[PDB]
Structure formats: C-alpha cells, structure tokens
Amino acid sequence: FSLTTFSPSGKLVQIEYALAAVAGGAPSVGIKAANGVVLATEKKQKSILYDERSVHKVEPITKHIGLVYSGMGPDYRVLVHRARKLAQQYYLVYQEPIPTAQLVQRVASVMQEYTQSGGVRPFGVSLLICGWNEGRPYLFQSDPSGAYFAWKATAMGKNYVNGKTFLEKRYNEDLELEDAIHTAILTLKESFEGQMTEDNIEVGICNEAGFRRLTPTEVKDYLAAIA
Amino acid sequence: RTTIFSPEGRLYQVEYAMEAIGHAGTCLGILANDGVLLAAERRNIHKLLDEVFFSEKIYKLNEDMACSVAGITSDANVLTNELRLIAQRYLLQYQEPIPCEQLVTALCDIKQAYTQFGGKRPFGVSLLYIGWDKHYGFQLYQSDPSGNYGGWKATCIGNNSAAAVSMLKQDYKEGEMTLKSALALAIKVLNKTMDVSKLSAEKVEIATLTRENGKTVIRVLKQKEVEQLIKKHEEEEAKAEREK
Amino acid sequence: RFSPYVFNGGTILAIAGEDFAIVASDTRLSEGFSIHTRDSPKCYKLTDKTVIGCSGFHGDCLTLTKIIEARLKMYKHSNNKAMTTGAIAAMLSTILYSRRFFPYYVYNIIGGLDEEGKGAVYSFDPVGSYQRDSFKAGGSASAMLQPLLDNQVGFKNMQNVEHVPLSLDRAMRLVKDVFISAAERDVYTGDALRICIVTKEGIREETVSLRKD
Amino acid sequence: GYDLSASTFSPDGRVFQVEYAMKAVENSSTAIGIRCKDGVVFGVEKLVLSKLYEEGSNKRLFNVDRHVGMAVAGLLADARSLADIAREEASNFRSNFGYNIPLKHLADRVAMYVHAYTLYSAVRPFGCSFMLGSYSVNDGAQLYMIDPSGVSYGYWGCAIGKARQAAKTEIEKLQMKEMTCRDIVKEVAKIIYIVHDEVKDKAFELELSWVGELTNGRHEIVPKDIREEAEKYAKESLKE
Amino acid sequence: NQYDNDVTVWSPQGRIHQIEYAMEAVKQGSATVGLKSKTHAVLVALKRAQSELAAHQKKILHVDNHIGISIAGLTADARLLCNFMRQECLDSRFVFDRPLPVSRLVSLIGSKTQIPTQRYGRRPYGVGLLIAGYDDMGPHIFQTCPSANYFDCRAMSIGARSQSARTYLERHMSEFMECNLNELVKHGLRALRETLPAEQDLTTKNVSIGIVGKDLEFTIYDDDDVSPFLEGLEERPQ
Amino acid sequence: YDRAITVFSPDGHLFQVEYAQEAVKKGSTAVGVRGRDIVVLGVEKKSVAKLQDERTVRKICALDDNVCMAFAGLTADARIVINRARVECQSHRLTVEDPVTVEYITRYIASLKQRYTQSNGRRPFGISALIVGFDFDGTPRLYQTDPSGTYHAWKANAIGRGAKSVREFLEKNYTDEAIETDDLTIKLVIKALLEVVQSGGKNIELAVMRRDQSLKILNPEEIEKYVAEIEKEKEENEKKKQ
Amino acid sequence: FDRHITIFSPEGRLYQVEYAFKAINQGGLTSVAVRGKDCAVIVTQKKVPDKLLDSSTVTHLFKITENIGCVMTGMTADSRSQVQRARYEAANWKYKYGYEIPVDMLCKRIADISQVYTQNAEMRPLGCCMILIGIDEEQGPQVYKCDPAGYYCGFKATAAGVKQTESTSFLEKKVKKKFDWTFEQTVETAITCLSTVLSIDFKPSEIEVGVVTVENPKFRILTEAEIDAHLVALAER
Amino acid sequence: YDRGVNTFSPEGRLFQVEYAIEAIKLGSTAIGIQTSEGVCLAVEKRITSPLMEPSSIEKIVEIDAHIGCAMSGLIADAKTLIDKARVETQNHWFTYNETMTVESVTQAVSNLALQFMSRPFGVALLFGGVDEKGPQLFHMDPSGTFVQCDARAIGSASEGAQSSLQEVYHKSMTLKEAIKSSLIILKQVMEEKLNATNIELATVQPGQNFHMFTKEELEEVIKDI
C-alpha cells in the first residue's frame, strides 16, 4: 500500500502496480531508422461522436523532440508541460536546443519526484522520446520509476511482448524513415481489433528538418501498404 | 517503517533496502599498485538496446574519481548528482580536489538521515568508489544503504557477491597485484559468477584508474580491448585442464 | 517632511522624605507658541504607594502609562501581589530600552514608598538609565529648579547650617515656591500646580493656581 | 469503512458524512421563513430546557447585516461561527465595492465556505442548515436556505428541523404572494404552535424577526405588542 | 461503538461522541454554584484537597475588576482560557479604555473553543465555567460548555452532584432578585450544601466565595474571610 | 500503549527508548578506566575480513585536544554525533575563549540524544558513548551516555556485548592499588577486555591520555608486551601459587 | 485495501476516481449537448419537487463568459465551485494574454485542475461533469466535455447523467445520416433525444435550453415562450 | 482511548496523562517538610554500582539561592523543567530586580505541562524555598497542577511515607527534628543500609541560602538514629 516502504524481498510494490497501468494502455510503437525516428500509436474512439481532431497522443516538445505514451492521458498532459518548460529553461540558459538525452534525464527526475513522498502516487504512463541531435537519431523510454532506456526499437502497452518479438524478427539497420513507418504500422496491425483507418492511429516522425505529426492524408497514403 | 526499532534492537527497512541489491547487477573493484579498476555486468542485454552512452553503470564524479552502483537506479541518479555537487563545492571552497574519503562521508551522512527522519525511504543503493588523492593514494570504498562506508582492497556488490568475495579471498595476492593481474582476475571472477555463460564482451563494463605525468586518468576499455582479456582466459583454464 | 516628534511642554518635580513622597507637575499643554489646554496634569497614580510623572511628547506619555497599567495587572495576576516602587522602576527601564532605536521622548520621575515606609524617588532618561535620588526635577524648567533644591534640601555651599530633615509642611511650601518662580521665566510652565502627596495613609491631591500668561 | 471521512466516496458515489451532518439538523427544533409581498418573516420554535436560563438565551435569529437576517437549526456553535463568517463577508464586500451585499451573492459566498468542509479528512462538515432573508427596493424580498452540503436555493416558504414536512404542508396553504408582513406574522406563529408537541418536549418560547418596508430594509426583532397579538391568534386558532 | 475515536467524525444518528465525552469531564470536578440579584453576582465553590495535609485546590479566579470565573473540569483548559480572557480584557482597556462586556467575552470564548470540535489534531476543552460579572447592563451569570455553547442564566450549578443545587435554585429563583448580599450568599451556600452527603458540611477550609457589584470589584474570600457568610446557616438535620 | 510509538505504557514506560538501548547491547565491547594522570579505554575489534583496510573502522575518536570518545551501537549515528560534538568543541571556544570541559560536551551530546526521543518522525540515536578526557586543574574525567539522554560519571564502566560481565570484573578488581602507575591502569583494561576477547591480543585496540600528551593510540608491539606480562603474572600466581 | 485512498491496485486502477463518476448520477438528471453547422446547443431538465422553491434559482446552465456557456451535471455544490474556478480562469486568461479564452483551453485547464486531486491525497475529486459550448474564430462551433479524472475531448454530440448510454445510442444513430445541420434541426434532435430516453412529453417548464450561434456568439438561456415554439413543431411531424 | 492525549474516555478521562503519573512511582522517593525555621528535602539516590560517582546523580538541585528542587521520574523532563525554572528566576531578576516566589516559579514551570512537545512530562517536582511569605513547599504534577503543601512525599514509597508524615507532623516543629523525622521515614522504605552516600539532604532557611549537606553533616545525623 505505502510507497516509502520496502518488502522483505526488496521490491517497491506501488511502482510495480503503476507499471501495470502502462501495460494496459493503448499500444505504441517506436523505431529508430538511420535517418529518422518513427512514433506510432492507436488512437481509437468509443463512438462516432468523439472529434478526433481535438486531442493528440503524439505531441511536440520542441522543433526536434516529440512524444508518445501508453497509459493515462491526464498524467501525460503534466509531463508534456514539464518537458516543454525544461527545454525552454535549457534554451534560456545556453541558447542551444536541448539534447534528447538531457530532457529524458530531467523528466525522469520529475517522475522520480513522485516516487519518494507519501500522499502522492507515481505516474501511470511510460513515454517514448524521439529526437535528432548532432546528426544522429535518438529514442528513449522513460518509466514511472524514474528509469530510462535507450532503444533501437520497442513497443509499449497492450501486447508489448509479441509486438517486440515482431520487431526483433522484422527490423534491422540500413533502413530509412519510409521503410520503418511500414514496419511500425505492421507492428500496430497485430493488435488492431478492426479495420485500421487514417483516424484510428496517429504518427509522428523526426529527422534533420525536425519533428512533425503526420496528417490523415499521409496516414491514408501508407495505410495502403504503400512505402 | 524506518523510524521504529524492534524489541531486539533491529531496523528492518534498513535490511530490506540491503536485500534490494541482490536483484541488481554485479559490480566489483580491484585495487593495485599501478592503479585501481571497476567491473560491472550489463544486465541490459537485448537485441534492440542501443548503447549510446559512454558507460551505463560507471559514473565519473571528478577528475580523480568514478563510481559504480547497484540497486534502485533512480536513487543512483540522485546520489550521483549529489556527489558531483559535493566535489565541486569542496573545489570552490579550497581550489583543491576533494579527497576520496570526505566525499564518501558526505554521501553517507545523507544516506543516514533517511533512516532517521520520518516519512522517507532509505536509498536502496550500494556504491563502490575508486579514486586517487595525495594523502593515501589509490583507494577503494564500499557504501551500504545504512550509511556505512568501508575501505577495501577488493570487494563485490550485487548479485552473487558472496561468491566473488570468496574467490577474491582465495586468489588475491596483496602487494603483488598489477593492473593486468587485476583485469585477469576480474575476467575470472566475473565468469565463475555470471549465470549466462561464455562471458560475452557485450555483457560487461570495465574502467581503469591510472596516473600519467602527474595527471589522473579514467579510461573505459572498448569491445576489442576486452575480447583479448576474454580470449586469454579460456586458454588459461584450458591449460589447467590439460594436466589430467 | 514628516517628523514623528513634538515637544508639548511639561515640568515635573519629586521630593522624598522619611515618611512621605511628593510628585508635582504643571497642567499646561502646548504646541509651538500656542496653548492646547490649561487642564492636563502630568501625574498618574499607579498603586496606593506609587506615583509617576511624565513630560515630553504627549503621545508617548499616553502610550507608556497605559503599558505600565497593563503590566501591573499582569504582575498582580501572576504573583498575587501589587508591585513595589523599585520593581516598577526596573520594569520601566526595560520598557524604555525596548525602543532604543526609536525612543519614547519622555522624561519620567517615579515617587513612592520603600518597603519599610521610607520615601523613594527614581529619575529616568528616555532610554532607561535610572537613579534613586532624594529630589529631582524634570521637563522644560529642570535647569531652573534643581539649584534651589540642591541649596535648600542638600544644604550645599551653605556653612554652619542646621542640617534639619525636611518635613512635609516645609517641603510643600518649597515645592510651591519653585513653581511660582518657574512660571515667571519659563513660558511652558503655566496655569495650575498639581501636587500628589504619598503617605502610609494613602494618596492625596492638591491644586494650586499659577499665572495664566 | 466508507463512512468515516468526507474525502471518501462509496462504490455508488455517496459521501455519508455530509448526510450524517443533515441527520443532526433533522434532530433540532423547527424554524420557518416565509417570503411575503413586501418583506420576509422568520419564526423559530425555541425550546427552554431549564427554568434557570434567562429569557433571551440561545438566540437562534441573528443579524448578519443591517439588511439581512439569519435563522439556524442544528448545532448552535457551528451556527454562531457561520454567522461570524457571513458577517465578515458582507463587511469586506462593503469595504471593497462600497455598497450592501446582495443575498444571492452572500448565499453563494457562505455556501462555498460550507462546501469546502465536505472535501477534506482534517475537518467534518457543518452540522447546521440556515435561512437568510433580506429586503431592498431594487432587489426586493429574498429568501435563501443553505444546507451542510453547500447547496443554495431560493424560496417562497421554507422550514428546517424536526417538523419540516408538517410545516411546509401548512405553508403551501398560504397565498403568501398576496399578503403583507403583519398578516403573515399570525400565520408564522400559528404554524409554530401547530407543529410544536408538548409531550415530546417541554415548554417553549416563540422568537420572531422581520425585514421589509415596515422596517425600511432593517432586520428587526418583532415588537412585543405584535408578538403577543400573534401568539394569542395562535392559541385561538388551536381550536381545530 | 466505532464512531468515537475522533472529533471530525459524525455518527449515523448525527452526533459527535468526543464532544459528549468531554462534557462528562465537567462531572468529575467539584461543585460550583452561581447566582445573581439585581445588584450583585455571586459565585460560591467547594474546594477539594488531594492529600489531607495539603492546601485545597483554588476554584475561583480573578479575570479583571468586573469579571470572575469558577471552574469545574480539567485544570489545564481552565488555566489556558483564563489567560485568554485576561488578555482579551486588557486589549479592550488598551484600545477603548472601557471594561469589556461579559457577553462579548463569552462569545469570544465560544468562538475559540469551537475550533477543536471541527479540526483534527486538537482536543476539545474539557472544562466548564460559571462566569460572574457586572457591566452597563447589570449583573450577569454565564455558563460555558465543552460543546462551544454558552447560556445566559439566572443561576446555575455545575460539577459533581450539582443536580441537588440546581433543584434548590429552581424553587428559590423568585427571591434572588430583591435579596440583599447576605441572603444571596446564603442561598448559594445552601444550594452548595445540598450537594454534599449528610455526613459532611461546609467549612472555612473548603469554601470560597466571589462577589462583584456596582460599588464592588471582584473580590475573593477563601478561609477566614468566609466565616461571616457561614454564620447564619440553620444547622440542618437529615 | 504498546510498541511502535513513543507515547507511554500503563506502567509508565517508553519502550522505543529501551529498544534503542537493546541496540547498544549488540555492538562491540568498549571499556574505560579513570586513573590519576592516565586514562585508558579499549575496544574490541570488528573481525577483519582479509581484504579490508582497517584505517576506516575507527572506534575511538577524538573531539578536541583534551577530550576523547569511544562508542558502541550503530556505526553511522556515531559519526553524526561525533561531528556535531566536534563542532561544538570549537563553537565553545568561539563563544568564550576558554576550552571545553568533559561534562559540558557530555551534557551537549546527551541533550542532542534527548532531543530525538521527543518527537515522532525522529528515531533515537542507537549508541552509547564513553567520554573520557582532561580538564584545567588536570582532573581526570570519565562519563557514560545512553540513548535516553542520561549521563553519569564513573570510575570505570563498559558498554556493548559483554558489559554485564566486565562490570563484575571491575567490581572485583578496580581499587586504588591498580591505578598506581600507568602500566597497571593499562593492564586492568587488558585483563577486562580479555574476559570477552578472542583469547588473542591482536583483537584489541587501546588508547591513553596524559595531562601532558595528546591522544596516543597504541601499536601491537606494546599491546603484545602488556598481554605477555599479564599472561606471565597469571601463570605464576593463579597456577604456581595455588 | 485498494479502494479507500488514491493508491494503485494490482491491475493498475484507481477506484476512488471511478467512484466519482458514480456521483454524477446522484442528482438524478440528464444533460444533452448537440453541435450544428452554425450552432451549438445544450439541454437539461428542470425538476422542482416543491412549489415553494423559486424556479428562477433552480438551474444547471451557467454563463462563464459572454461567449461561453455551460451545463453542469452531478452533485450540485461541487458544480458551483468548478464553475467559479472556470470563471476565474477565463478572466485571468484575458487579463494575461489579451483575448478571450477558447473552449479547447478552458476545458483542459479545468481537467489539469481535476487531475491534481487524483494525484494528491489532499482533496477529494468533484462528483460533477461539465459540458461547454462556444464559437471559435476558424474552427467554428465547439462542444467540449471534461471528467472528474481530468479527461477531456471534443464532441459532435454527447450527454451526461443517468440516461447517457441510451442517449448516445440515439445520437450516434442520428449523426451517421449527416443531414443538413441547422439551428432548428439541432434543437429538435436534442429535445427528441431527451424525450425518448425519459418518455415524458416535455413542457416548457420542465427543461431549460442554452444556445450559441455563429450569427450571435453570445450565450443566451431561452425562455419558456421560446421553447414552446420548438416543442409544438415536434408533434406535427 | 488509552493511547493518544487528544482522546477522551466515555467518562471524560485522559489515560496517557494518568500513565504519566504512574511513571513517578518508578522513581526513588523524596520528602519535603515545611517548618517556620526552614524547609528540608531528603531523598534516596539508588546507586546501581560502586563505580559510578554518586555526585553525578542530581536528584536535589539549586534553582536559586532561596529555592531548591527535588524530583522523581524521568531525567530528561527534569533537566528541561529545571532549566526553565532557572531561566525564569533570572528573567524575573533582570526585569523587576527582586526574587521570584516559590508559588510563581511553580506556576511558570507548570505552564509547560499545559502544552500538547507531544508527550506529558513524566516527572513530579517538590519546590522548597523561602519568600516574603516565609518558608514555602510546593508540589508540581505532570498535569500542571500545583498546590502548597506542609509535608509531601513523592516517588516509589510515597504512600507509606505520607501515611507516616501525617502522624509525625505538627505545625510547631523545628528543623533539626523534621530532618530526623524525614530520615526515620526514609529508613523504613529502603532495603539498603542507610548511609552518607545513599541519600542527599538540603535545607533553605530564612537567613541562609540553599545548602546541600556533606558527608560529615550527614553522618552526624545518621549517628542519632
């Protein structure tokens, strides 16, 4: 129950249960090609009434950093704001855009602030942080514990194990940003309980030009198994 | 909770934080006359992990020191920033590098205050420190989650520490320990303790501390520089099997 | 620009005896060259044995006496007795040093009875340095009254004289004689002379007129 | 359990402490208030537990401003406190905006202070409901009631306490929108005498207050010559 | 049964049992009586000693030259509230140079004691007071309760075995108004005597009296100053 | 009223204060003896581990030139108490130029420990301290402090695992005869530490202070000499004369 | 246990936050909101049990700004607090930034406020839902809803209250045909939904209707003499 | 109801405050006696080893040259309250330039017990001194309750010692005789041979300050027993 308490085995139980809230959110894919990084996720609604052009699971932090998550969107909107502030603090001091690793460190610090006090629960989200700094792509994975991992490809959320084996068997380097989007959508198609439309998913890419959330037209283009 | 004694004068949260380290990766240190080294195992083993960083478990604290950690990693990232702040405060205050024992006392005074002051959890992290100073030379220390540091000549923290300790007791040759000897011993202790056999070079991390022309040096051996260390081990224990 | 002080005139006097104590004052209140009122006595009864005089800035004279009256009640609550003259004096010494950097512009004289019935006169500075005396003057005419008291009470610069102790009837005539003369050369000394006599039987009051010029 | 804190929900979205705080108002003596055409009239069933208490003790009608009155039912210390808050609200309103506070606004400001106690573990909810009443030439007559939950609604007639049902069943008979205050006094006293039960509890005192044209927007205790002239009508209408 | 360990908890019947339990701490102190004529207000107490060879506990306290209290309950709460009253009266003399009315003091006392009934981490004041005073409206007798409630009274007795004194006072209220001081004090003493066993009686050691009026500050008569007021009591049989 | 809070019991006890003393009944034995111009304390060693530098296992710790200290119990609480006493030893020369006395700093340490028995959210210091030192007038002093904030003065005392057995030894042995010279004041501590020791001599660490000298920790070249002298004086008396 | 304080459960769920969605249905009323091509409408029922209440004070529609209007559903005292906070935020937005707050932003500000109550154990969540409406510069009319948990989204139509599933079935059945949306069609759709799920044959006194249009962006609460005009047209066809 | 000082019993009781009283009987016994010639204080020390210097056991202490205290209960509470009394007696001198009375020292020291620090003080104190009103003896309790006493016994054997004082006490005594009576009572509630290190003794006369007896003065009264 309590968070400032170890078990005799030496485990933190509320953190393990906060990860269970990440393991039940919508899937999210991440692939790091040679000249870019892809972020894709399932954005599916419970009715035809929900306007999908109003909320976004893929969000920018800067011109060259972007996010997705698996789990709780209320928790996501806090870390989006915090990351956007920390990037601006870094810019205000150094007048250089923040590297993708320092943001992950400073954001895992925020996630760790919520693991040590009583009267606060941890975040029920994991993040995937894409970037393009120093002529190289980056992809990280921040957890509620305050721990981050650099990946070449991974998947979070529902069926995050088979979706990762699929990448282990269907991913290599010597790719580019267009061969990776096809692989990410194919990795999302495993868990898609229905017809995949341009409005049921959400895609964002980063490259030399910076981060951009693709449009439904571009999604419908590659949804035809095209490129 | 940590602010409560047992009738037998015990503190069980402090023991559970210490039990929370066997789940962590193995890290050992070996002192020598030419220098001092660390050797961690990378349990971050996966076909899709990138390994962008210089080092994942060896953290540099100063121009004359590094450390390795085992336990909760968020706590480690906290303590590694606090260490770097203590060092620079000493430098700002005296304009001389901090000795390799004042830093350990300063961090252990932080770790002790979490076993004593209300609603906060003890840091589930043990640490090893290697460094040089102009008072006692090359040193090796070992912290515990209770705020208890100790000087060592060779120790091990994390998974299967009690076995590596017994090996070091039976193969350390105090007074005649060079750095090649220490690495040759490390590749042995780290192979007779790892569950995954054959000791891939992808699954370890080694750092040496030495001196050159009155300057301190902290290097990290590359892949090809550790392949040689591995190849000169099966040859050594294949010759200890020839005499049948 | 705003200066927080102003001198409202005032003159006070006290004499001690073996069985009594007098504390006297004028009743004029002034403001520059003008006169505020001609009925404003500077003497205040604290206990059955103790009287205080206050002269200087009138706002501080009003504040400090209320503070003293509020401290007496607290003493009586905590200790179940009334205060002595020396205890009130030593307390006022701290109340005044509480404002060492923004002082009470007040010239104070306490007059009462010791713990064996003898007279007692304590004279203060605005910052709390106090001094037991036999007679002291304070206020605007203090420079004018003390020589004649030094002569006719201390018997100073007078040889082959009868060093007789001062009785009450002599002290009262002397007290009236000094204000009758200070009203002739000092412009702040004014209309009436209040005299509060302290004795074992209680505290009296007497009003005597002076010239209104 | 699920009924020990106001920071706690039940599996059906209920907060039982706030309801238990209303159970305390249900167990208190009855007060009523009726909005007339040109004012408001309060009446309280004031119980005298002992003959040693003076006539005037435990006043349950409060003046919160020179144009606003207040009648309470429940815990009385809580009511005195809430009166003290309703007074500083109206005080600060005049201090900041320079005119008498309206009652729709005062009701909201007190309702929120009451609602704030339904959210925390360190405090309980208030144990008193109460009516406010005012009259102004512009705003007219007004009557609001505020519950422990923090709800606030306007009224033409209202009751709080034990005999709430019995009293509103008599107030709906009144055509209050036609009448004046001196005629509704008789009705207020008649209802309080109808709902009072002499066997369930001992003798009682009748306590009345007014606000309207006949007081010029000044909340007043009713004079004695009129309170007696209404208590008499109450006795003579008990022949029924 | 299990809505009792905290004051911020209601019961399903709409009650707070910690307050009801604090009210039971007044029944543990010795008995006090209060009564008033149209000119004077009187408090008589019965003091109690811990060891026989010690002094009797003091029951009546001076608050100002026109207000005084008699206490039944916990000593510490009484010592805190008395020091509250004293400063609230000094604060009124400092600003206005007038004595604080008694209604405006007991209202403040109620406002003060209401907080522990509602916020957790503080105990309800387990002390009851009878407050006798005199102001521009005549004499007053006020009861104060651990429930943060207060009453204006013609007379009242509180403490152990106080129902006897209350029953006495309830049938002599019609006389207290035109009574002089001696008769009023004697009614108080007889109501107090009705709280004792038949074995015991009133004595100089165990009786304190407090009186305030128009031409009389609040004085206290404790041991030998009481014997004028005892002379006159009929030696009751049983 | 039971464990887990510093409240009270029906008997009038505070069990969280006793359970901290139970931690002082778990460390290594530490003795102290007061003489005339020498004062000696000794502490059992902590079972060295074949690969450890014993420079950092300091059980005996000086606070100033005239005062010294030895502790038993939790090892980390000792360091904080000792640093906070070392600071006061200098703040006392700042506030008044005179040096500190043994009772002053013992009282300060005891107040610091008392301060941690007052609140929840604070855990008592699980140590005791033998605080030996000197004064102006050269009066030797010895005090003993417990977690509860209590301090007394002693002619000789012990703390740790075996104090209940060394107290009987010093009861039977401590007189004015065994403090004739320094070498007899040290032999008493050696014999007392022998009653719980490994029958060795390498498991012993003794320090001494004189009116002239500063603190002086001994080397095994003298500990061995004293232990051999004591073994010889016991082979001759207990065996060869009875 | 895992249901009293806001901790996580083994399956990663927060039950005290789910139990605050159940308080929305304690008031016993249902709200409906519908969006058009030039309009946006909110609708709710106005149930007075007593004739002694003044019907003017019994409302669940509120004016946040001149251009934004709300309907609140759930516990009545929580709604006034959330509405006053919405008004404070809308006012400070314009004080700081110099233009009127959108609905897209006010909604997420309220949601950000509500999420802190789930992440900090100081205060309870509010047992209230909130539907806003407003006309945007480029986006057009907007319908936004927010939850006790801090979830928010835009809608073409939605409901809040007891009859919310059987209202969102009606609405999703009518929305697919994609007729020429208008003011009159919008209000008729809302009233028909609330009539079908309740089966009550409404009066003008039993409902209150707030509207906002591109012609007049000012939120206005309708009169009984203007609801009757739309009610009569329903019985015809 | 038993644990916590903010919780009333159904009968209106504070059991933690009573358990603070019960912590006094775990302390050794002390006796104080009034006399018109002065006040006496007499205590047991309870030495646990011959190695401890018994002068380091402060069970009677000087508060000022005219007031002396004797305590029983917890050591820490006693240190706190004794420092309070010493500081107050000198603040009084600084302000008013006179000697605080024993009643007022007791009143000011009892006001800390009126503070829930989160725990009642587990210590009772006897205050013996000389004032304008002559020799006075007072007794402070963990409840902050204080009262003047002519003779009082606190601690372990307070019941029997009090049941003896009520017989050997009269309001005409001398100080040499009361000192004899106190030690005779102390003899009977000890399973250890009364001697000049197992007890302390102090007096406060009008024309003499606080004075703790010595081994010589103690043995010269132990002899006549």
Residue numbers in the entry:
A (entry chain B): 7 to 233
B (entry chain C): 8 to 251
C (entry chain M): 1 to 213
D (entry chain G): 6 to 245
E (entry chain F): 4 to 241
F (entry chain D): 3 to 244
G (entry chain A): 9 to 245
H (entry chain E): 8 to 123, 133 to 241
What do the paper's sentences say?
The enzymatic activity of this system is carried out by the 20S proteasome (20S), a cylindrical, complex composed of four stacked rings enclosing an axial channel. In turn, this barrier creates a key regulatory role for the proteasome activators (PAs), large particles that bind the 20S, open the gates, and facilitate substrate selection and entry.
Next, we genetically installed NLSYYT in place of the last six native residues of PA26 (PA26E102A-Opt5) to generate a PA that now bound the h20S (Kd = 360 ± 160 pM) and potently stimulated its activity (EC50 = 42.1 ± 1.2 nM) via its C-terminus. The cryo-EM structure resolves a single particle of the PA26E102A-Opt5 heptamer bound to an α-ring of the h20S. First, we confirmed that the disabled activation loop of PA26E102A-Opt5 does not interact with αPro17, suggesting that this structure allows the determination of termini-specific mechanisms, as intended. At the occupied α-pockets, most of the P2 and P3 Tyr side chains of Opt5 made H-bond contacts with residues located in the reverse turn between αPro17 and helix 0. Six of the seven α-pockets contained well-defined density corresponding to the termini of PA26E102A-Opt5. As previously predicted, the α7/α1-pocket (interfacing the α7 and α1 subunits) did not contain density for Opt5, likely because this pocket does not have a canonical Lys residue (α1 His68). Hence, we categorized the C-termini in the α2/α3, α3/α4, α4/α5, α5/α6 and α6/α7 pockets as binding in an anchored (A) state and the C-termini in the α1/α2-pocket as binding in the unanchored (U) state. The dihedral angles of the P2-P3 residues of the bound Opt5 form a β-strand structure for the A state but a right-handed α-helix for the U state.
